[PDB]
């Protein structure tokens, strides 16, 4: 019965136009919408090299995932700006970035507290429990701490829906092994990752040079290092979460839980938190 | 080209039903949504008396409303629960309350920062600006206090669409044009008058009209020119940028309504004003 199109923005309506990043296919500008008076963050193609037709329905395919996946802890999109010219998805934008950022970025932030951290996870794991429990299912297939964004208040927003897929019925660490040896479990693997990479702040595989050989590791049963150097002892429930990581990032897809399982047994831990 | 269909809750999803707040035809209850995980605000209509289907009419409209207006600073809504037994419109759960809750509560809240209040009027400001530049306009018509909701951070969320109108109960926060029933443009004008005896609620933390115990009387008092006191008392003398505030304040709430400024007006003067804050 209910429905909502997606508000379609004219061009002169962005202003003041600067770069947040740029990559192969997407860049990420920052910009004042004249009329709402917010400062909005548009993720658009170059607007130098000429628009082809099989990226502009990619856009258009996005924008429609993110629209049908509002939700508090998804990236929320305003509107579609959609021009002979300009193609770009109009979002919501973010002042503390990224969460790599938060994680790695050490003399900027010494301390990250615990209960911080664990709203975090939390946060992630209800975003992408939302999106596993729409009809058909949303898979994410791109988790990333390079992906989880953070507003004004640290709370979280996951982004970049370029790889997601209905059910139907770049780095490889974040990969679950069956994605390459010669996916529906794939998003909580990520997770698992995401979830060591919170914990330790350390670059997953950081000393192992060679992708390629992550990903024989990987495929062998390695994963990232759990020890006292990585995993500190002064981590709440650290028994626990290691024993949630380990189940999470399984060589066996059937030995993962759903992320509705790993809310219920994630509450436990957070319950002890403010 | 896109578009998006507001989800459909079955009744069974939503758990632990506790009671917020109850009226006349507005009931809240907070729940738990057995799937997402996350605690939602419902907003049904009594459980106990039979749903009329003019009753019910009403509410799919507020929830289109809502579905179509979501803004960072409006209330998101999640779905809608449509049952025989059971109409509600389920939104996220604000656990702050309203802002007369943090205005009027001198105790819970001793000293509320300045910077903190005038990011409040800002972020009404935003939220009222982009319902009104919609295609067709909306208009709130129903903005109080009591109807703008706080988040765990203390970030505005516009709520209750109920009056809502597109363009093309207290009585105080009501221009005096309004009072009475051909129809015009002046209808425009509403939700900046609105706005103004809620920046002066805000600057103030009084009750408008606190002495006025008829309400009658408001209504006369008001129809003549009389406003919320403006003296050394009620707005005090610390208020940054004081003079400013006042004379936009008068402004929004003129008598004629020709002299009230839009919300993009509002937000070009208030700009000023938000400069000098962190």
Not at 52 to 61: A, C, M, P, Q, W
Not at 156 to 170: T, Y
Not at 192 to 200: D, K, Y
Not at 228 to 254: C, F, K, T, V
Request: glycine share 4%; proline share 8%.
């Amino acid at each position: 019965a209910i429905c909502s199109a997606l508000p379609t923005i004219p061009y002169h309506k962005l202003a003041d136009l600067r770069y947040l990043s740029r990559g192969a296919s997407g860049t990420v500008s920052s910009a004042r919408h004249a009329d709402w008076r917010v400062q909005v963050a548009v993720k658009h193609l170059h607007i130098h090299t000429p628009l082809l037709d099989s990226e502009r329905k990619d856009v258009l395919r996005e924008a429609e995932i993110l629209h049908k996946a509002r939700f508090s802890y998804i990236l929320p999109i305003l509107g579609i700006c959609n021009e002979p010219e300009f193609l770009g998805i109009v979002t919501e934008y973010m002042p503390n970035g990224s969460l790599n950022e938060l994680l790695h970025r050490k003399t900027e932030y010494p301390d990250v507290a615990w209960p911080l951290r664990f709203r975090i996870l939390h946060e992630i794991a209800l975003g992408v429990n939302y999106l596993h429990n729409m009809t058909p299912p949303l898979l994410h297939h791109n988790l990333k701490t390079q992906n989880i964004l953070l507003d004004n208040e640290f709370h979280v927003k996951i982004a970049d829906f370029g790889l997601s897929k209905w059910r139907m019925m770049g780095t490889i660490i974040y990969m679950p092994p069956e994605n390459y040896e010669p996916s529906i479990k794939h998003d909580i693997y990520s997770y698992a990752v995401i979830t060591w990479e919170v914990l330790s702040r350390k670059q997953p595989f950081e000393d192992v040079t060679n992708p390629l050989q992550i990903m024989y590791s990987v495929s062998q049963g390695h994963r990232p290092v759990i020890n006292e150097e990585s995993l500190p002892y002064d981590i709440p429930h650290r028994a626990r979460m290691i024993s949630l990581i380990e189940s999470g990032w399984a060589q066996n897809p059937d030995e993962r839980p759903s992320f509705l399982k790993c809310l219920i047994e994630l509450e436990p831990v957070l319950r002890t938190f403010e």
